[PDB]
Structure formats: C-alpha cells, structure tokens
Amino acid sequence: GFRKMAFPSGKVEGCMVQVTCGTTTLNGLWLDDVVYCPRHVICTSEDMLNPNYEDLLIRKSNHNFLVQAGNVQLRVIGHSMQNCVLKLKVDTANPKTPKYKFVRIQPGQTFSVLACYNGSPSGVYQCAMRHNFTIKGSFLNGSCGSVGFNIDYDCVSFCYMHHMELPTGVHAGTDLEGNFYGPFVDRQTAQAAGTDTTITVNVLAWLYAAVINGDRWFLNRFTTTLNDFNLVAMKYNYEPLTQDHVDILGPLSAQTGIAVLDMCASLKELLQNGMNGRTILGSALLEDEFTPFDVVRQC
Amino acid sequence: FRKMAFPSGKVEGCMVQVTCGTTTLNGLWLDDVVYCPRHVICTSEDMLNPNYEDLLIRKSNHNFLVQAGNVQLRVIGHSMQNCVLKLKVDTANPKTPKYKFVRIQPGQTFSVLACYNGSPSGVYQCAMRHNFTIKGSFLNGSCGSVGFNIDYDCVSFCYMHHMELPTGVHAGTDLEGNFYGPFVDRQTAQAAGTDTTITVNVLAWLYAAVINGDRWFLNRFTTTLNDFNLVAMKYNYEPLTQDHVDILGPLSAQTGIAVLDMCASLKELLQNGMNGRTILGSALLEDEFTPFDVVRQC
Numbered sequence: 001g002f003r004k005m006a007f008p009s010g011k012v013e014g015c016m017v018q019v020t021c022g023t024t025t026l027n028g029l030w031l032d033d034v035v036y037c038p039r040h041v042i043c044t045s046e047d048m049l050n051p052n053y054e055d056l057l058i059r060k061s062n063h064n065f066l067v068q069a070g071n072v073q074l075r076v077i078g079h080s081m082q083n084c085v086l087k088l089k090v091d092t093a094n095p096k097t098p099k100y101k102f103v104r105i106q107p108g109q110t111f112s113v114l115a116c117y118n119g120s121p122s123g124v125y126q127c128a129m130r131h132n133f134t135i136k137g138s139f140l141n142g143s144c145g146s147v148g149f150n151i152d153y154d155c156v157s158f159c160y161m162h163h164m165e166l167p168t169g170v171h172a173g174t175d176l177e178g179n180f181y182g183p184f185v186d187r188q189t190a191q192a193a194g195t196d197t198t199i200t201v202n203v204l205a206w207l208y209a210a211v212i213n214g215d216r217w218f219l220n221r222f223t224t225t226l227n228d229f230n231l232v233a234m235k236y237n238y239e240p241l242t243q244d245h246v247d248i249l250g251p252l253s254a255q256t257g258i259a260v261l262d263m264c265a266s267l268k269e270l271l272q273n274g275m276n277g278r279t280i281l282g283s284a285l286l287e288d289e290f291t292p293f294d295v296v297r298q299c
Numbered sequence: 300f301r302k303m304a305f306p307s308g309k310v311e312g313c314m315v316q317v318t319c320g321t322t323t324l325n326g327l328w329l330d331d332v333v334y335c336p337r338h339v340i341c342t343s344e345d346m347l348n349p350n351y352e353d354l355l356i357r358k359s360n361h362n363f364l365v366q367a368g369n370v371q372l373r374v375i376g377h378s379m380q381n382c383v384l385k386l387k388v389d390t391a392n393p394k395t396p397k398y399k400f401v402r403i404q405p406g407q408t409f410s411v412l413a414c415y416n417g418s419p420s421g422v423y424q425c426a427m428r429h430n431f432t433i434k435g436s437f438l439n440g441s442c443g444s445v446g447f448n449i450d451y452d453c454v455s456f457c458y459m460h461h462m463e464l465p466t467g468v469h470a471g472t473d474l475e476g477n478f479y480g481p482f483v484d485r486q487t488a489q490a491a492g493t494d495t496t497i498t499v500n501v502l503a504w505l506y507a508a509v510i511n512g513d514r515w516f517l518n519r520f521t522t523t524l525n526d527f528n529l530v531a532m533k534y535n536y537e538p539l540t541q542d543h544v545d546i547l548g549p550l551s552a553q554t555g556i557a558v559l560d561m562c563a564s565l566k567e568l569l570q571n572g573m574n575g576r577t578i579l580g581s582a583l584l585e586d587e588f589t590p591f592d593v594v595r596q597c
C-alpha cells in the first residue's frame with residue numbers, strides 16, 4: 001500500500017534536448033532560450049583526465065555546438081560556463097517551459113530522476129540525496145545531463161544534473177548552478193565518497209508509513225531519550241536525530257499516536273536485534289529513501 | 300537495479316475528469332472518446348449490487364460533466380462496454396499519442412499514473428500478480444487512473460483502476476472494461492486467489508545476476524518443463540508457460556545458459572535454499588522485474 005512514487009515527468013520531458021560537440025553527445029535541459037548541460041560535452045577522450053575547462057571553452061565557437069530538440073535543430077547564438085554547467089543561448093525559446101526554480105537540496109531529501117539518452121526520456125524513478133552526497137540511481141553511458149526535480153503546484157524545482165558513476169555503482173552530479181553535491185570532480189578518474197551514514201529521520205518516517213498501512217509488529221512497550229537513541233544510532237552509522245527531525249515527524253506521530261521517541265525505541269530494537277527474517281512494507285532491510293513529506297504526500 | 304516507470308507525459312495529456320452528480324472519477328481522453336469506470340453513474344445505495352444497464356438507461360448525454368482542467372468537453376454520445384463507460388465528446392484530443400489497448404499477461408509490469416480529480420499525482424511500476432491483483436498505491440478518488448507501457452512512442456494502455464481488496468492490493472480492468480481476475484465492480488469484499496511467486500521474473504532476475512557476474516547458483520543439471528512445474532507448485536511458484544520460455548529467449552542467448560538449465564538452478568535453490576548466500580546482494584529473490592525490465596536496465 002506504500003510505493004516509491006515519482007512525480008509525473010511530462011513537464012520535464014518537454015525540456016529535454018540533445019547536445020553534441022565533436023564526438024561527444026549528452027542531454028541538455030532547455031528552459032526559455034537557454035540549454036543547460038554538463039560542460040564536459042566539450043571534452044574529447046584526450047581531454048578527460050585533466051580538462052582545463054576555461055582553456056577548452058575559449059577555443060570553441062557557437063557553431064561547434066549541435067543542439068537537437070527532437071528533429072529540430074536549435075541555433076546556438078552564445079555560450080557561458082557556470083561551474084560545471086554550460087549554458088547555451090539558443091535563438092528559440094522553449095514554448096513548453098514550465099514554471100520552474102533551481103534549488104540546492106539537502107542530504108535526506110528525495111527527488112524524481114528523468115533518465116534520458118540522446119535527448120529522449122527513458123525512465124523515471126525516485127532518488128534520495130545521501131549524506132555522503134551520492135545517489136543510488138540507474139544510469140548508463142550517455143545519461144549525463146539527465147535531471148532530478150520535485151514538483152509543487154505545477155512549479156518544477158530542478159535540483160540535480162547527472163555527471164558521474166562512481167566505482168561502487170552509486171552516482172554523483174551537480175545542482176543546476178553546476179556545483180557538485182559532495183567532494184567529486186568532473187574528470188575521468190575513479191573517485192570514492194565519504195562514509196555513507198543512514199538517514200535516520202527517513203527510516204523513522206518509513207516506520208510510521210508501515211503503521212499507517214496496518215503493520216505494527218516492530219513496535220514495543222519501551223521508550224528512549226533522544227540522546228540515548230543517538231548514542232546507539234551513531235554506533236550503527238545512523239545520522240543523529242535532531243529536535244528539528246523530531247518536530248518534522250510530529251504529523252506522522254499525531255496521525256498514528258506513536259510518540260517520536262517511542263518509534264525511536266522501536267528502531268533501536270530493530271538495530272540491536274535485527275528483523276529476524278521478517279519484513280516491513282515488503283522490505284528485508286530498513287528503508288531510508290522516504291522523507292516525512294513523501295509519506296504524508298502518498299498516505 | 301531500480302524499478303523505473305515510463306515517462307508519463309504522453310499519458311498526462313490524456314487525463315480528464317468525469318462527473319455524474321457528485322461523483323467524480325478519472326477518465327482517459329483519446330481522440331474523441333473518454334473512457335472511465337462505469338460506476339461513475341452509481342449513487343451510494345446503487346453500489347452494493349448495481350443494475351448498470353438499468354442505471355444507464357436513466358442517463359442522458361447531458362448528465363455527464365467531462366472536464367479537462369476546468370474546461371468542459373461536451374458529451375455527444377455514450378455507451379457501456381463491459382465495466383467501462385465510453386463517452387463520445389465533440390473534441391478530438393490534440394495530445395492523443397499513438398496508442399493501443401493491450402490485455403497483459405500475469406507477471407508483466409507496467410507504469411501506473413495515479414490521478415485524483417483528473418490531475419496526475421505520481422507514477423510508479425506495478426506487476427500483474429498471477430492472482431490478477433497489483434500491489435499499488437491508491438487512495439479514494441483514484442479510480443480511472445490507468446496503467447501503461449511505452450514502446451517506441453506508442454503507448455500500450457493495459458490497466459484502468461477500479462478496486463482495493465480488503466487485503467490492500469488492487470484490482471481493475473483492461474481498457475475494454477474486462478476485469479483481470481475474478482472480480483466484479485460492486486461495493487463488496489472480494490478475495491483473490493493464491494498469490495504465487497512469479498517464476499518467469501525470478502528466472503529473469505537470475506539471468507540479471509549472471510550478467511553481472513554473480514553465478515554461484517548455476518549447476519550442471521537440466522530439467523524438463525513439466526518436471527520443473529510440478530516441483531515449483533510445491534513451493535508456491537507459478538508454473539511456466541511456453542510464452543514464459545520464449546520471453547526468456549533473449550536473456551538465455553545473451554548468457555548462453557539454456558532456459559531449462561536455469562530452471563534446474565532455480566529448482567535447486569527452492570529445494571536446498573540459499574544457505575546464507577546472496578544473489579545481487581539480496582537473500583530474497585525478486586519477482587517483479589520482467590525479462591524486458593532486465594534488458595532495459597542492463
């Protein structure tokens with residue numbers, strides 16, 4: 001009764017285009033008369049290991065950039081670079097531009113990813129920004145420039161553009177100002193992320209989700225203080241729960257009548273005892289990619 | 300591997316609302332027809348056991364409020380086909396995609412665009428269980444939301460939502476109004492059949508594991524199809540059909556592991572267990588990725 005649920009992607013699909021420079025092709029986002037895309041579209045295989053991006057860009061001319069919106073070619077009439085993003089001014093404004101904002105999200109927040117190849121949308125799914133600033137996505141060769149977003153009353157808040165797959169199989173990218181999430185760099189190197197701690201407030205939100213959907217087996221008659229919970233949480237590489245997190249869980253607490261610290265005592269038991277093979281909402285593991293908002297929005 | 304829905308835009312452009320009285324359901328606007336669940340015509344005391352034919356005779360075109368947003372589409376004809384109502388409207392939808400109506404087989408996955416008051420709310424992947432239910436996420440007001448697959452810009456509509464069973468799973472029809480499974484559209488508690496594990500999808504999952512280099516479970520045995528099906532039934536696994544064997548063909552060729560050899564490997568896993576080992580990082584076998592999903596992702 002509770003599923004990972006993406007936002008409808010139509011407003012973003014109408015913005016996806018193809019950007020080609022030489023032998024490199026990736027995806028771009030076309031809003032008004034500007035196409036946003038990863039700047040390493042200008043790199044050849046020789047440039048990848050140590051690209052001096054300003055020195056490479058100054059050598060390019062507008063006509064070196066081939067931008068295709070479906071079948072139609074869009075004429076590039078100017079370009080600028082903002083951090084790791086290239087902004088191509090085109091001679092045609094996108095008639096399907098939605099109301100939109102660029103936002104930089106916080107670890108723990110979720111967004112929808114529209115995975116695209118050759119400027120054509122392929123799939124949509126939810127992702128969470130993890131505490132080490134990676135996301136557990138599904139991206140293949142040619143996916144760069146795919147974007148992540150949230151939608152609120154027909155306004156699309158773009159928060160992610162895709163750049164990289166780490167050796168561990170997780171993914172890294174930038175906001176739409178071209179600043180990476182995390183300590184990653186847009187060069188062709190094998191990069192490791194920091195320690196990935198679990199998003200505690202999201203696990204708790206999902207335990208409330210299970211209760212709303214009629215499952216209570218993991219509850220117990222005990223309680224805990226906030227600091228005693230956090231001591232155990234940190235022992236298991238969970239993020240410490242703040243009073244802001246407790247406040248954010250209030251509505252789910254009030255809906256279910258289970259105090260936040262009572263659910264923390266439930267999670268403490270699950271961490272110390274395991275699930276003993278049983279499952280929660282279909283999962284054999286503690287799910288941490290639903291926010292309190294995601295639970296309320298869906299329930 | 301992620302559960303990935305199809306991009307929903309081509310379907311968003313077809314969602315409308317249909318109101319009769321105070322009852323508002325979602326509808327699907329393709330060319331100059333709107334399709335919706337027929338019980339939009341029901342009142343509260345009509346729903347325990349509706350006489351839909353007698354209820355429809357008391358309706359006229361002007362009793363139906365069809366809206367795209369707040370814009371009314373005038374109804375110029377109406378008819379009933381199984382459990383769906385077809386309203387002819389005076390405007391052909393300019394956003395109509397290339398489309399087909401398909402009746403899917405159990406095990407197959409599709410994308411659901413959940414909608415409320417004609418307004419799309421979220422999208423997610425579902426598998427049709429072998430008892431013809433789906434594990435969806437649907438609230439009051441969701442009926443008429445549709446499920447679909449997209450192949451080369453052609454939208455194949457396969458599901459329209461009608462019901463939540465007492466067990467919390469969901470049931471509905473194809474776009475010709477024929478229920479999947481033994482369910483009926485009235486306000487009554489109905490039971491599904493046994494929910495078997497989707498064998499063909501577990502086999503697809505095993506192929507995905509082999510593709511990614513996780514192949515400890517491959518054995519040196521083979522089986523006949525009939526011997527496997529008789530064993531599978533004892534573990535609440537669905538018997539394989541010839542169609543299942545054939546849709547595993549591409550993965551079998553990709554890996555060089557014959558379908559029946561993979562069946563013998565799964566049979567061993569069912570009879571002896573995983574014994575603490577994992578496959579693609581999980582101790583549980585996934586049964587909601589189809590052979591197509593695995594190729595679409597690998």
Ligand SMILES: COc1cccc2[nH]c(C(=O)N[C@@H](CC(C)C)C(=O)N[C@@H](C[C@@H]3CCNC3=O)C(=O)c3nc4ccccc4s3)cc12
Nearest residue numbers: 040139140141142143144163164165167186187188189190
């Ligand atoms: C020895 O180097 C490694 C060692 C160990 C792991 C590694 N990972 C990467 C790495 O990710 N590189 C970046 C590109 C860098 C420059 C940001 C990259 O290929 N992005 C992809 C999406 C990738 C591809 C597979 N699925 C993922 O999502 C993308 O679409 C782009 N393709 C190109 C092709 C040509 C020019 C620009 C781009 S941008 C390198 C690497």
Ligand SMILES: COc1cccc2[nH]c(C(=O)N[C@@H](CC(C)C)C(=O)N[C@@H](C[C@@H]3CCNC3=O)C(=O)c3nc4ccccc4s3)cc12
Nearest residue numbers: 338437438439440441442461462463465484485486487488
């Ligand atoms: C004693 O009766 C029960 C006992 C035990 C379990 C039960 N389940 C149902 C049952 O499902 N009824 C159908 C309706 C029937 C007629 C197909 C129904 O409410 N469909 C919903 C989607 C539901 C709602 C909750 N989330 C689900 O997906 C839908 O959208 C529709 N709403 C209306 C409202 C007014 C008129 C038409 C429609 S059609 C009844 C029932």
